[PDB]
Design an enzyme around this catalytic site. Sequence first.
Site, mmCIF file in Angstrom:
data_model
loop_
_atom_site.group_PDB
_atom_site.id
_atom_site.type_symbol
_atom_site.label_atom_id
_atom_site.label_comp_id
_atom_site.label_asym_id
_atom_site.label_seq_id
_atom_site.Cartn_x
_atom_site.Cartn_y
_atom_site.Cartn_z
ATOM 1 N N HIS A 61 7.536 -6.806 14.272
ATOM 2 C CA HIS A 61 7.425 -6.200 13.132
ATOM 3 C C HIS A 61 8.701 -6.177 12.419
ATOM 4 O O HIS A 61 8.635 -5.941 11.191
ATOM 5 C CB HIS A 61 6.945 -4.693 13.348
ATOM 6 N N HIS A 91 16.591 -0.115 12.422
ATOM 7 C CA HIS A 91 16.038 -1.188 12.273
ATOM 8 C C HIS A 91 15.841 -1.153 10.633
ATOM 9 O O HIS A 91 16.141 -0.444 9.914
ATOM 10 C CB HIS A 91 14.625 -1.365 12.807
ATOM 11 N N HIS A 93 13.708 -2.466 7.048
ATOM 12 C CA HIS A 93 12.512 -3.321 6.430
ATOM 13 C C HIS A 93 13.063 -4.202 5.017
ATOM 14 O O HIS A 93 13.921 -3.616 4.408
ATOM 15 C CB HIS A 93 11.507 -2.192 5.709
ATOM 16 N N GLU A 103 10.842 0.902 1.392
ATOM 17 C CA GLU A 103 9.745 1.591 1.888
ATOM 18 C C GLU A 103 9.955 2.737 0.819
ATOM 19 O O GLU A 103 8.771 2.642 -0.217
ATOM 20 C CB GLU A 103 9.864 1.844 3.276
ATOM 21 N N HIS A 116 16.753 1.936 8.481
ATOM 22 C CA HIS A 116 16.155 3.318 9.181
ATOM 23 C C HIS A 116 17.017 3.434 10.489
ATOM 24 O O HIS A 116 16.886 2.667 11.604
ATOM 25 C CB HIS A 116 14.667 3.074 9.511
ATOM 26 N N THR A 195 6.647 5.204 9.197
ATOM 27 C CA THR A 195 6.226 4.420 8.378
ATOM 28 C C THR A 195 5.381 3.275 8.835
ATOM 29 O O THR A 195 4.790 2.469 8.044
ATOM 30 C CB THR A 195 7.314 3.872 7.344
ATOM 31 N N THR A 196 5.296 3.057 10.175
ATOM 32 C CA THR A 196 4.420 2.189 10.913
ATOM 33 C C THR A 196 3.444 2.922 11.744
ATOM 34 O O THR A 196 3.711 4.062 12.281
ATOM 35 C CB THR A 196 5.272 0.969 11.757
HETATM 36 C C1 LIG Z 1 7.577 4.804 17.211
HETATM 37 C C2 LIG Z 1 8.555 3.733 16.730
HETATM 38 C C3 LIG Z 1 9.004 3.854 15.303
HETATM 39 C C4 LIG Z 1 10.186 4.511 14.920
HETATM 40 C C5 LIG Z 1 10.670 4.637 13.565
HETATM 41 C C6 LIG Z 1 9.938 4.278 12.555
HETATM 42 S S1 LIG Z 1 10.180 4.112 10.893
HETATM 43 N N1 LIG Z 1 10.090 3.161 10.291
HETATM 44 O O1 LIG Z 1 11.794 4.614 10.918
HETATM 45 O O2 LIG Z 1 9.468 5.440 10.504
HETATM 46 C C7 LIG Z 1 8.434 3.671 12.551
HETATM 47 C C8 LIG Z 1 8.033 3.351 14.210
HETATM 48 ZN ZN LIG Z 2 11.521 1.860 9.571
#
Ligand SMILES: CCc1ccc(S(N)(=O)=O)cc1
Ligand SMILES: [Zn+2]
Length: 257
Positions: A61, A91, A93, A103, A116, A195-196
Amino acid sequence: HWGYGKHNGPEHWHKDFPIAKGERQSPVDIDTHTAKYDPSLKPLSVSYDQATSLRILNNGHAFNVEFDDSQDKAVLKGGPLDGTYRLIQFHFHWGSLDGQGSEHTVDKKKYAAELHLVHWNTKYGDFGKAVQQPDGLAVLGIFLKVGSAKPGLQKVVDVLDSIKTKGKSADFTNFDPRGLLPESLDYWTYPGSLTTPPLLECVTWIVLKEPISVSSEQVLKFRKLNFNGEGEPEELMVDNWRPAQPLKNRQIKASFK
Ligand SMILES: CCc1ccc(S(N)(=O)=O)cc1
Ligand SMILES: [Zn+2]
Ligand SMILES: CCc1ccc(S(N)(=O)=O)cc1
């Protein structure tokens, strides 16, 4: 399973994750004129000097840079937060083109990418318990625009060739996440979600106002990653962003006047 394609993307997620249509979903558009300065916000403290990175993983992802969170090594506190939140991973996006990828949006403006930095509230003992709490997580979000290269990002860029496909990982010790921050810590904050999938409503979002600049060459290398596993038909890892969701009964607060 879920993804970012036409057949498994954000419009489909609600069928397996009904909270996708919930009351505090992320990301959101940040209307800068509607956001209000909040004098009750305490100074934000990003304390990453003892951060201990371990590994970088292509999870199909995005890619995660993972940290040792067995002790208070790298933490986020202050701002809207009560207590201490420990860094577990970061990570990004990003888009297929420079005009999309973030996002969160700012007055409907999309940035090329969004970083993020994910933290969990130490009062809950572990990440898994934290994501069962309304104040379990804090995510520090940082926009990326294309311009001059970000020197602190290059080590990440250079290891991507070794984790091209889903399930690949590589050692990634001694990386300093301080090199990914902009100069200013001015921010907006609101209560939201992952957000996932599983889209859990556990996140205090802290989105920095100042973007970082990365070079075209740096983001082009993100776009060479694959969603697929080794030996499978190539699907470029691009456009791994969820669009803005309804603000509903929320107010976005600003740390700055
Ligand atoms: C549970 C893993 C995870 C951690 C962080 C995110 S996010 N994109 O930072 O909301 C999404 C998913
Ligand atoms: Zn994220
Ligand atoms: C490694 C990048 C970096 C940049 C600035 C600092 S600081 N806040 O000036 O000590 C520390 C680390």
